[PDB]
Amino acid sequence: GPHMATGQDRVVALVDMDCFFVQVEQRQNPHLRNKPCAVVQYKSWKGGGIIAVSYEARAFGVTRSMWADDAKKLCPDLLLAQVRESRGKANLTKYREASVEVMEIMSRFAVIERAAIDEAYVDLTSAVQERLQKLQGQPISADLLPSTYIEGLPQGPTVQKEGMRKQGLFQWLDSLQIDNLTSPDLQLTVGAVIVEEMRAAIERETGFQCSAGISHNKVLAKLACGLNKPNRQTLVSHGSVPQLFSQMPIRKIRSLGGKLGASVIEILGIEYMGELTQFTESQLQSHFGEKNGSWLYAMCRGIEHDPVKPRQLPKTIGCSKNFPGKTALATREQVQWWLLQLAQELEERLTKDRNDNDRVATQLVVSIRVQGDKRLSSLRRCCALTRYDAHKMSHDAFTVIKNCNTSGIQTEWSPPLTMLFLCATKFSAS
DNA sequence: ATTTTGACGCT
DNA sequence: AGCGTCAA
Ligand SMILES: Nc1ncnc2c1ncn2[C@H]1C[C@H](O)[C@@H](COP(=O)(O)OP(=O)(O)OP(=O)(O)O)O1
Ligand SMILES: [Ca+2]
Ligand SMILES: [Mg+2]
Numbered sequence: 162g163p164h165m166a167t168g169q170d171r172v173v174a175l176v177d178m179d180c181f182f183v184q185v186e187q188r189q190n191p192h193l194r195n196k197p198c199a200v201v202q203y204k205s206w207k208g209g210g211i212i213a214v215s216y217e218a219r220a221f222g223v224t225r226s227m228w229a230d231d232a233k234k235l236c237p238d239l240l241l242a243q244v245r246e247s248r249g250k251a252n253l254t255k256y257r258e259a260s261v262e263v264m265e266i267m268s269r270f271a272v273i274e275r276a277a278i279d280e281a282y283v284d285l286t287s288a289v290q291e292r293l294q295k296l297q298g299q300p301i302s303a304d305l306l307p308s309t310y311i312e313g314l315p316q317g318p319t320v321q322k323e324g325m326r327k328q329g330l331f332q333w334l335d336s337l338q339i340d341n342l343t344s345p346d347l348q349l350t351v352g353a354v355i356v357e358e359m360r361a362a363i364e365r366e367t368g369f370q371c372s373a374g375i376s377h378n379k380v381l382a383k384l385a386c387g388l389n390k391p392n393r394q395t396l397v398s399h400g401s402v403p404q405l406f407s408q409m410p411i412r413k414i415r416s417l418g419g420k421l422g423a424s425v426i427e428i429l430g431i432e433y434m435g436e437l438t439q440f441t442e443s444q445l446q447s448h449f450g451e452k453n454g455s456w457l458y459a460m461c462r463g464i465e466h467d468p469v470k471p472r473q474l475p476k477t478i479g480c481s482k483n484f485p486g487k488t489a490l491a492t493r494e495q496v497q498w499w500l501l502q503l504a505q506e507l508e509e510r511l512t513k514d515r516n517d518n519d520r521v522a523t524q525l526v527v528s529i530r531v532q533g534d535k536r537l538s539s540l541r542r543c544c545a546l547t548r549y550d551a552h553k554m555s556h557d558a559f560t561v562i563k564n565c566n567t568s569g570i571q572t573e574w575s576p577p578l579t580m581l582f583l584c585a586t587k588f589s590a591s
Numbered sequence: 592a593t594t595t596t597g598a599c600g601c602t
Numbered sequence: 603a604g605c606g607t608c609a610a
Binding site: 202209210212253277452475477479483485488 | 592594596597
């Protein structure tokens with residue numbers, strides 16, 4: 162009752178760019194705008210692997226992970242843009258730079274946590290308080306929320322999409338108490354007004370559209386964001402949680418899409434997030450551990466305390482290349498040449514990072530996979546990163562992996578290498 | 592033969 | 603530290 166926390170103490174948003182790499186390529190090449198199109202890396206093997214797909218192309222069934230040759234079978238007029246290739250490998254620089262454009266705009270509104278190349282969480286609690294003080298008891302107009310959905314509404318006693326959206330928004334705004342500056346629902350609504358402004362700024366200043374979720378924590382904001390993609394935002398209130406979770410597959414909640422989620426389903430014999438409420442906290446801890454159990458117990462009630470971390474920049478800078486099938490590296494010269502290629506890209510990115518962000522990486526992580534090994538990585542070894550020099554970094558990586566070559570003949574490498582990975586970590590201010 | 596990334600947890 | 607999980 163009066164002491165049961167309800168996890169309504171924050172306003173958190175999650176902004177996720179729509180079909181991001183596709184929009185970057187469509188901004189650059191207007192011929193691709195409003196077309197079924199996809200972004201592909203490489204081309205020789207089955208037309209290249211698709212990594213991003215416009216919504217027009219998704220209507221034909223085109224998906225990520227599909228080979229372009231296969232996507233063309235579903236969508237013969239599919240347009241394709243290829244990822245840049247530099248030093249023999251795919252180079253994602255254009256998308257990292259576009260990401261910086263968006264992150265820098267979002268940071269004008271609030272502290273952000275960069276969650277991925279095209280997603281950031283926003284802690285809007287303070288901005289909401291300020292905006293509520295400015296508003297001075299003034300009601301919030303539907304015109305301030307032109308792309309907002311209120312999850313769960315309309316309800317109770319038009320057949321078009323926008324009509325339903327407006328009916329739900331009208332019900333929501335009709336039922337708010339605007340004089341109570343401590344109302345969580347009012348706080349979320351002001352949050353959504355701010356997110357409309359943030360999304361408009363992103364689109365105005367970059368050309369890119371995005372979706373967003375607004376709720377009281379990161380997990381619900383993320384879930385909310387996906388409910389009405391693309392180019393829309395969704396408010397998930399605390400009160401919407403029981404109905405929303407009553408038919409929500411467990412795997413849809415962030416962190417439960419893999420083995421742990423499968424084990425929750427198997428061990429407990431349930432399917433939906435809401436079914437978790439019938440277990441005690443101790444029961445969940447007994448099956449899934451102290452941390453996961455407490456997290457599950459609160460999360461299924463819509464409560465999560467994970468903070469929006471103040472971090473706009475990635476914590477690592479990495480370069481990776483697979484060598485599948487017959488391309489596996491089988492000679493010392495091959496391994497050294499590709500380590501150099503990776504190291505040269507890493508050097509270029511690190512030097513730019515040091516100039517832009519006043520920091521230096523101090524550790525180099527080298528990871529490889531050997532042909533035959535079932536694990537993704539066969540070996541992961543660190544060494545010191547003391548100079549931004551590609552030849553030195555490639556030599557040091559070779560030094561830390563050379564003992565993996567079983568072959569008695571020095572010129573041959575066995576078992577052949579199917580993956581090389583260099584990652585700069587442990588940044589210090591400079 | 593999706594590939595190329597990142598973050599964080601465990602021991 | 604090195605390995606594993608989960609997510610763009
Ligand atoms: N598995 C992957 N491998 C390589 N790149 C990926 C992968 N998944 C996503 N990306 C890249 C391309 C995407 O445009 C970008 C953002 O990913 P993601 O948010 O999951 O999808 P998306 O932005 O393309 O579409 P949308 O968010 O509208 O559903 O990251
Ligand atoms: Ca996205
Ligand atoms: Mg994303």
